[PDB]
Design a protein around this ligand. Structure first.
Ligand SMILES: COc1ccc(S(=O)(=O)N(CC(C)C)C[C@@H](O)[C@H](Cc2ccccc2)NC(=O)c2cccc(O)c2)cc1
Lengths: 99, 99
């Protein structure tokens, strides 16, 4: 598909038995999801943006379905105001910018 | 161009005869540049990102040539971690996400 940018590029993602709306975000190196109690090992991390840093938990090799496309990789979980699909997963679903 | 996402989508912009590097950022509503001088009137504004809220200076109707494509619109100047081109100008240059 082609997604124009008149509005926020929100799409449906699935992680386990949670469907969420998330931004397809070319400005995000990593994928950042709102607080959720995922199973498995994790490591603490700090990530920064406008307004400063937040603390997140880094979970590796997490399968995520994005608009019906399968992805698997690192997801950061913490008190983000919005679910963010970053480049690590955008590449896996074949996403490009075009103009 | 078609821009893949294995690397940050950084592009050269021309703003006021100055060349800068900026990140094409679909997760940003607004275009936010690091501290710089721009001519004309501006308005104080606040914007929120992943880490909280910041104060910026809002300049309206500013020309920017983004990777060879002309835009004229609102530019926010303030303590963003990197220069970002947001949807307000990505739309002007006909940028879409495709997968
Ligand atoms: C290392 O991985 C990451 C590091 C940083 C980020 S990031 O989120 O700070 N961030 C990194 C960049 C700032 C370099 C990604 C952005 O697209 C961010 C996404 C967004 C949207 C709404 C609310 C919060 C955040 N947008 C914004 O900050 C934003 C949102 C709305 C209006 C506005 O003026 C700016 C993401 C991933």
């Amino acid at each position: 598909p082609q997604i124009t940018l008149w509005k926020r590029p929100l799409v449906t993602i699935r992680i386990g038995g949670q469907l969420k709306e998330a931004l397809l975000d070319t400005g995000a190196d990593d994928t950042v999801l709102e607080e959720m109690n995922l199973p498995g090992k994790w490591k603490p991390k700090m990530i920064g943006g406008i307004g400063g840093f937040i603390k997140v938990r880094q979970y590796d090799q997490i399968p995520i379905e994005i608009c019906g496309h399968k992805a698997i990789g690192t997801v950061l979980v913490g008190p983000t105001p919005v679910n963010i699909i970053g480049r690590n997963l955008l590449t896996q679903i074949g996403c490009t910018l075009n103009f």
